[model samples]
Target: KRKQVALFSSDPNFKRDVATRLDALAIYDVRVSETDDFLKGPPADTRPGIVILDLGGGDLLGKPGIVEARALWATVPLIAVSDELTSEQTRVLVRMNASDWLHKPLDGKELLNAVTFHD
Candidate 1:
């Protein structure tokens, strides 16, 4: 069975870009949701194998959803994405126990690799 990858982001472009890349590969199921909906939790009867959280230049450790996500998807691999992150931000991800992270301007190969290797 294909694993489901849930992406939480407010940006439509980011959602479309990721879906286009992953959809072409067709190896996993891609699910997209706004940050608000994601905070409400995964949809009924659906559990994601991986959760991609878009930090979007916000404070790395201060993003509201990160904490809730840790609580909700405790065992799932959580990969963060951003355009540019500082050293402190990367450290924050480690402190938060994120499975991995990806810088934006993501090539299909890099995104695929992160998903495949992390999961």
Candidate 2:
């Protein structure tokens, strides 16, 4: 099976960890992204099985464009990562069609599970 994930995050450290950890999971190919990538436009690549959006640090949700980018996707699952995601935040994330959410300093096992969710 072909597994891919589109990662959208502004934090460099978090992005690095997500990339390294996902690769270590050996479940899917994790594509890393930052400012330009998001501003560039839609994902264009649909090979990703999952979509992980790093909603700003601690409290700030990602850019409005984040939601826009997500809308561009129809089937690919969405994963919201944030440290300050409150209950309401979680609710909004789900309401926005995100398939999952992870708190900051993401858990390796949790990430692995999210990545292989389709399986």
Candidate 3:
């Protein structure tokens, strides 16, 4: 079965890029959401294999989404994508046990590798 990837971001370009990259692989079922309410988690009954959270270069630990994501999907791997990440933000990800971090402009190959590695 193809893996399900749930992506939450407010950026349209990032959403499009991620969908395009993962769709090309023909191995992922990518679902993109632009909602800011991270507490809501992924749409419905579907459980995602991977969750991609776009930090948008904001306060990583301060955002309730990180905590919510962890709460919602405790065992699923999370890949954080951002334009720029501070050392503190990086540390927060490590503390949160994020599977991988990607910098923008995101590289398709690297993103694919991260997904494959976690798989």
Candidate 4:
């Protein structure tokens, strides 16, 4: 058994893709936010065990939503996923102490590995 995950992404297709993959693992309770609106905060009723963010748009790290989430969920594991992040961008996330970075197109096993048993 596992706690639910909060997945935030601006890409519409990826939102579904993530949900489908997680469902295959018998973890169907993912709370997915495909809009930037979720940057403000996650859903009021759900407490996710982990957060998966797709920081593909410009300056997502500097965005208020990420900052707020970071501060509010200080102890939760935050995994950043992107296909377009520059090496510098990845480093910035590293400094910010993201739990892990996964590049897209995402491998199902890799994602499951990170979510199921992240180091």
Candidate 5:
């Protein structure tokens, strides 16, 4: 089996279409969670092979997404997914750390490429 993918996002499109495609690929078990819901547990307690955190949406602030990312950045394989980011925001994600950074409009092929290319 490939890996389970835990996705934290507020966008309906990502939560639905992207997730469905991942599932259909038969290569990933994708778990979708709203940002606030995803952070209810500590990073260590989450059981996904990889994580995809969405910074594209507006509702992540005041949530523990950043906290989880900081804690796991050095230990777990993480991928930051976003769109419409400012340079400064991108800089912060550099500090946030991820195995890869992907912009929105994620298609099946692109996502599979990302997963295949990473460790």
Candidate 6:
């Protein structure tokens, strides 16, 4: 079966671009969501096969959705994109149990490869 990917990023244009490209690569669906109180309070039962998080370009700090994501969907794979990440930031991200890390600006082929990669 094809896989579905969830994208949580403040960069709408970039997120759409990634979604478009991944869709071309045969990922079943790309669901872009708003990270708000109602949406992020808890994890959903049907977590996407992968959750790609762009930590830059957004107000992710202290976001409940991200906090829930870090804890609730521990089994599901995670991919994080950051710009100008520091050691502390990296440690926090790693502590969150991300499956893989990607730094911006994205390299198309590498990002695509990462998206399809399995553990």
Q: Which number leads on TM-score?
A: 3
Per-residue accuracy of model 4 over 11-68 as CA lDDT, tens digit each = 8888888888887878546888764644565556767688888877536765645555
Task: Report the Cα lDDT for residue 53, model 3.
Answer: 81
lDDT of 6 by residue, 6-114 (tens): 7877777777888889888774567776534223523454546787788873346444445455665556677877776666566567676777778788989878878
Question: What RMSD, rounded to one decimal, does every model reach?
Answer: 2.4, 3.1, 2.1, 2.7, 3.1, 3.0
**lDDT scores in order:** 0.75, 0.69, 0.78, 0.73, 0.68, 0.68
lDDT digits (tens) for residues 61-88 of candidate 1: 5665556556677678877787777787
Question: In candidate 2, what are the lDDT values of residues 1-119, reduced to their tens digit?
Answer: 64777788889898888888878768677788863364444455455677777776423333455455556566678787877666766655665687776777777888877767767
Better of 2 and 6 by lDDT: 2
Residue lDDT tens for model 3, 48-102: 8998888786554666456656766767888888767677776767766778878
Model 3 C-alpha lDDT versus the unseen true structure = 0.78
Worst window of 10 by summed lDDT in candidate 6: 34-43
**Tens digit of lDDT per residue, candidate 5, span 22-101?**
78878787778876655554356546677778777434533435655457434557777777666656666676667777
Better of 2 and 5 by TM-score: 5
Between prediction 3 and prediction 5, the one with superior lDDT is 3
Q: Count the backbone clashes (under 3 Å) in each candidate.
A: 0, 0, 0, 0, 0, 0
- Candidate 6 runs further than 4 Å off: 35-47, 57-68
